[PDB]
Structure 1
């Protein structure tokens, strides 16, 4: 059962954008592909994302890879949302590539929030 998956190169450039990713983020394949993955997140992560990838490539010490994390994503329409992110590392043509699997947690957040306010 497919999820929103994205594939970037070692510079954060999108290479593949799944159909489900399109529905979640609001960007079509063609629109996303040549863009930096940072277009899918609000600030401050956005401007710091390249340094996150860079930091990892040099230190080889993961903070999300093999760990997973829940973060805020940003749609094309400008709206933000909570999402769980898992990152896999791969190799192709001698260069590193990264695979991201996104799980939308909007509903989860809403339910939890609704239960919270209804006492």
Structure 2
């Protein structure tokens, strides 16, 4: 039951788990109705809707069901690495996407500390 975010086909946050609140700093009510791009930094932020549009038309997976590390952005403006897995679903005839997130800040810190010593 980690950080899970569900968005519609236009990238608007539909569900936002409790763990996602603790990780991103946004309450579920504040997040719901916002675009998922509020969780990442630029350039990705301004680019995110184009990535979603691209996929929706080419039916071309780039990261759907792949799993990878990106940098996300918390409410206070701080950035952090996180592993992200996007899953695709359908409901009411329209696409929905789910993102499972695993915070990796601690890992990056440990790795960094071990490097500097």
Query: TM exceeds 0.5?
Result: yes
Write out per-residue CA displacement over residues 8-58 of structure 1, whole angstroms, 9 at most, x where no aligned residue: 000000000000000000000000000000000000000000001111111
Indicate the RMSD between aligned Cα atoms, in angstroms. Answer: 0.5
Alpha-carbon distance, 1:91 to partner: 0.3
- Write the deviation string for residues 47-100 of structure 1: whole angstroms up to 9, x where unpaired: 000001111111111121111110000000100000010001000000000000
Matched, 1:49 2:48: yes
Deviation >2 Å, runs of 4+: none
Number of residue-to-residue matches in the alignment: 117
What does residue 93 of structure 2 align with?
Answer: 94
- The runs of 5 or more residues in structure 1 that have no matched partner are none
**Could you list the runs of 5+ residues in structure 2 that have no partner in the other structure?**
none
The alignment's TM-score, normalised by the length of structure 2, stands at: 0.98
